[PDB]
């Protein structure tokens, strides 16, 4: 009966730390204690306890006696949702940052209509030049079509 | 002077030097105390130029923890004298004198070669290790070899 007394004590205190309702508080945790009866169970407690005494948010312990819906905080799967507001804004902010850093870069380059592709015959092409041949022979131009992806070189 | 300890690789981030007419990478605290500055306030006093540089000081710890077993001068003098090639059997008596005239002459000869001045060389090595640990922690670009 260790938990039968401790789950209560901790619930009572961390739910008062925020007159007659004693039986409504006791009825709720007693239903919640046998609810977790559905060592992995112990891990479920730490979730309930922590979000309550994470003060900062009075709403939770302050908005837990007014009304609420009770059996929801069990198969919740809303650990992101259950308090508090600023955090939710961050997890929505951090997500966009993570979705952005998971992608990759692209290509810039200038396009001119002074060349034509041999495949699709479009006048959108970038280029650059290197010295492939000797010091007597002219430069070598490398062209690339910015439509189909074709590439060619100049003499 | 070589700095070991690859970024989180190679286990110890220790510093080991190299001398003329020796065989193995001799540590650095051993050459400091081998020149005659056995405490630690004098060593960390020579190397770093501030008492707030706890990052360089953070990298220094393994050097003193490496040079703990030697505590006075003669055992470090002969610690160096035994490696420096030479013959094989110039024990403590003559071998200490061998390492001594090694650490007067070959080591940093452009500074001086007359006795009673090893302080000067200790200051110089302080500046050198300082510059190395300024380049390693990335506060100043590596030298260009073609300037």
């Amino acid at each position: 009966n260790k938990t039968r007394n401790g789950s209560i004590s901790a619930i009572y205190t961390a739910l008062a730390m925020d007159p007659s309702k004693i039986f409504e508080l006791v009825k709720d945790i007693e239903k919640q204690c046998f609810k977790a009866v559905n060592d992995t169970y112990r891990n479920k407690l730490r979730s309930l306890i922590m979000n309550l005494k994470n003060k900062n948010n009075p709403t939770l312990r302050r908005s837990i006696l007014d009304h609420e819906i009770i059996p929801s905080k069990l198969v919740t799967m809303s650990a992101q949702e259950l308090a508090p507001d600023s955090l939710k804004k961050e997890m929505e902010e951090i997500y966009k940052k993570n979705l952005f850093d998971a992608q990759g870069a692209t290509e810039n380059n200038s396009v001119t209509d002074r060349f034509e592709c041999g495949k699709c015959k479009q006048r959108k092409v970038s280029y650059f030049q290197k010295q492939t041949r000797s010091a007597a022979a002219p430069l070598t131009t490398f062209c690339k079509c910015e439509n189909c992806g074709n590439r060619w070189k100049f003499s | 002077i070589k700095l070991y300890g690859r970024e989180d690789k190679g286990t110890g981030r220790t510093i080991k030097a190299t001398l003329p007419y020796v065989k193995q990478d001799i540590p650095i605290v051993i050459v400091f105390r081998a020149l005659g500055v056995v405490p630690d306030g004098e060593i960390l006093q020579h190397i770093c130029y501030d008492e707030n540089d706890w990052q360089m000081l953070e990298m220094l710890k393994p050097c003193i923890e490496e040079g703990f077993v030697i505590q006075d001068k003669e055992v470090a003098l002969d610690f160096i004298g035994r490696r420096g090639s030479a013959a094989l059997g110039i024990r403590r008596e003559k071998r200490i004198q061998y390492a001594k005239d090694i650490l007067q002459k070959e080591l940093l000869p452009h500074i001086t070669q007359e006795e009673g001045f090893e302080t000067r060389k200790t200051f110089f090595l302080g500046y050198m290790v300082n510059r190395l640990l300024l380049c390693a922690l990335e506060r100043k670009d590596q030298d260009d070899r073609d300037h």
């Binding site: 952005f100 850093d101 992608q103 990759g104 870069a105 810039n108 380059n109 200038s110 001119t112 209509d113 002074r114 030049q129 290197k130 010295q131 492939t132 041949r133 000797s134 010091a135 430069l139 131009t141 100049f154 | 260009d144 300037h147």
Partner: protein, 194 residues
Amino acid sequence: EITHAISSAKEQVQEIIYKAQHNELELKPGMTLRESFEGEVSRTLNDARDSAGRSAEMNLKDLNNVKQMVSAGSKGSFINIAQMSACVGQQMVEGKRIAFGFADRSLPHFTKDDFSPESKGFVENSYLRGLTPQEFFFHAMAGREGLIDTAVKTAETGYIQRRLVKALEDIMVHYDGTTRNSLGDIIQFLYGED
């Protein structure tokens, strides 16, 4: 028209530097801030050179000899007219630009941390007008790069070809389609598949 198209391009540059210095620039995926910045500048300047070069090319009349030698396709192409009538353009060193040999500056004739177009290689004239000394120096640097690479790769390719030829020099086509080597290892059962 050409001088104005460059002026707005140059003015535009002044804007990108401003953003980068007030932390208001979008970071590109896979790239640090400074890489994205350098990429951006280069796109703007290369567009300007092409835009200016395209302008000079289209003005030309229907007897400008060069338009006949290029229009005939016998010798040259667009970059020549562009680099003789408009702007010489950019200078490159290993894909990146004129690095800082001196500490935090290109030449001693410039201040520190100067990054305007002409401060890191962007030539601004055409060979008919002339070249300022700094621009001439950078151009000489780029040409030297070209001559070095040309001096490097050719022998490499030659030795590569010697390995290829010494590897493949006994593969024949025997009287029935097989493509056997020197001792019968059928390489291809039917030459060229057809």
